[PDB]
TrEMBL record, chain A:
<protein>
    <submittedName>
        <fullName>Uncharacterized protein</fullName>
    </submittedName>
</protein>
TrEMBL record, chain B:
<protein>
    <submittedName>
        <fullName>Uncharacterized protein</fullName>
    </submittedName>
</protein>
<feature type="compositionally biased region" description="Basic and acidic residues">
    <location>
        <begin position="7"/>
        <end position="27"/>
    </location>
</feature>
Length: 158, 152
């Protein structure tokens, strides 16, 4: 299992059935697709690469800009870098980020802090919400998302 | 033809008590709808700066879904349900999640309006089971699962 997270970023906002994203997808051996016929199956989970991909079935009411047409819109994803059981992300990160880094180094690379609390930092950079989360002092994960109405009314993005 | 347990209230996660008959465990409101209602709230804490892993989110969702109370009904009648199979399109899963109490009210009426006169239906037994599902505080039921799933 080797997907390059930085390449996920350009499919952000695109649909379930976007040919380039579907090609990209089954190129890395996924073929799980999102559906709602059985349950709310809107995440593609890759447990031991350390990645979760999240889709919304209601892009418009959430204020998410749809790019390609379709019923499932790719809203964001989680890059997990820590877990007691296996399943972290070893591949490369955007904007020169490293799992080793500390909050201060992370801060220095993303340059645009929007909210700081005991355990998460929110940054807005290149049309994307980035949230870094810290278990203890350890970098735990990095959640990315397209702008939403929730994130707009929390003043994290415009 | 009445099964002994047509209309018995039972967690979705209970397979022991009803194995034997063709009874289906109907979700009112639909399982996907609770699941979205749960997610809409999780989304909001995250936007508030909460720290919730996706592992955690999926665990919560599964509890919301599989611990729901559900009413055992027979399969032909379940087929006329509002959220059966492909009837559960995104727009109806969206509207249901934005007001659970209305959703269970609509869902259980059409079940019961189609259990009329059916010999194997349990319209008497179903309506009593339905009433408590229209009255359950579903919005609470999700707040509990969320707080459990995030306590560590």
């Amino acid at each position: 299992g080797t997907m390059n997270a930085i390449d996920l970023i350009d499919f952000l906002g695109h649909s379930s059935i976007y040919q380039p994203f579907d090609e990209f997808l089954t190129k890395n051996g996924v073929k799980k697709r999102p559906a709602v016929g059985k349950s709310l199956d809107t995440t593609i989970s890759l447990e031991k690469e350390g990645l979760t991909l999240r889709f919304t079935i209601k892009a418009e009411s959430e204020g998410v800009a749809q790019k390609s047409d379709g019923a499932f819109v790719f809203r964001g994803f989680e890059i997990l870098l820590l877990d007691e059981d296996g399943g972290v992300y070893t591949g490369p990160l955007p904007h020169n980020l490293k799992a080793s880094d500390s909050r201060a180094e992370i801060e220095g690379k993303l340059k645009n802090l929007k909210r700081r609390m005991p355990e998460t930092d929110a940054y807005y950079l290149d049309g994307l919400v980035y949230i870094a989360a810290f278990d203890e002092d350890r970098f735990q994960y990095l959640q990315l998302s397209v702008p939403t109405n929730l994130f707009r009314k929390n003043n994290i993005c415009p | 033809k009445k099964h002994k347990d047509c209309g018995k209230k039972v967690p979705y996660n209970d397979k022991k008590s009803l194995k034997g008959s063709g009874l289906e465990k109907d979700h009112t409101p639909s399982g996907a709808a609770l699941e979205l209602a749960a997610q809409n709230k999780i989304d909001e804490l995250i936007a508030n700066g909460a720290r919730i892993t996706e592992k955690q989110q999926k665990a919560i969702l599964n509890s919301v879904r599989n611990n729901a109370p559900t009413i055992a009904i027979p399969p032909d009648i379940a087929a006329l349900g509002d959220t059966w199979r492909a009837k559960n399109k995104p727009h109806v899963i969206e509207k249901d999640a934005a007001n659970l109490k209305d959703a269970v009210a609509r869902n259980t009426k059409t079940i019961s309006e189609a259990m009329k006169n059916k010999d194997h239906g349990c319209k008497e037994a179903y309506d009593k089971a339905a009433e408590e599902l229209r009255n359950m505080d579903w919005e609470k039921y999700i707040d509990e699962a969320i707080q459990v799933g995030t306590k560590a």
